[PDB]
Amino acid sequence: HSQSLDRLMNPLIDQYLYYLNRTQNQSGSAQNKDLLFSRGSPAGMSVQPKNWLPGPCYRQQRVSKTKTDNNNSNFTWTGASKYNLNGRESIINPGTAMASHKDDEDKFFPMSGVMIFGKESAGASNTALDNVMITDEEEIKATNPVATERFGTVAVNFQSSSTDPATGDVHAMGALPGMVWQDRDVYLQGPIWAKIPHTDGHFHPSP
């Protein structure tokens, strides 16, 4: 997609829907809480009412291809994303379709969120970084989130005069209504089909 998902508006005209710009009037002394709304935006694009949502997310671990910027533990299987099925844990690998990294962060890759094809001279046990092919997945940064990044922040408490508006950090997100996403890329090495398992229900059966 040659457009982002949060960049689907005319960059010239401003909207007709308002929003809350400010919960504290600056009268140069202290707090006032006058609840200032204002129209927008042609320029404050991050606060506008959008119409759609980015896809589901389930965070992997941010691992550098450069060995000097990784933790000295092992790691994997300690800080990996995994699921309990009948009381036994299994790494997600590669998980839902998400982008690999942010803008100009080519050194990072999700711990199990990328296809890693082997080259020749690559054994079936404990091969180094050179003899594999980590498939960088960055063309779906528009709709899909980043697999090493949170999918936003919800609020926790009720804001009042007494308690500050604490927000919590979202990591995994099931599908809300209005989410759009784009499925995982195929490769010249990677698989063509898969069998949808004959269950009573399945959600968006892409492998």
Binding site: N72, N74, W77, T78, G79
Partner: peptide, 19 residues
């Protein structure tokens, strides 16, 4: 997980993985 770990101060938060 290992028998032998090396944790650097002040950061004290580790995991022994006997799984």
């Amino acid at each position: 997980s290992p028998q032998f770990q090396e944790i650097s101060l002040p950061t004290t938060s580790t995991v022994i993985d006997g799984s």
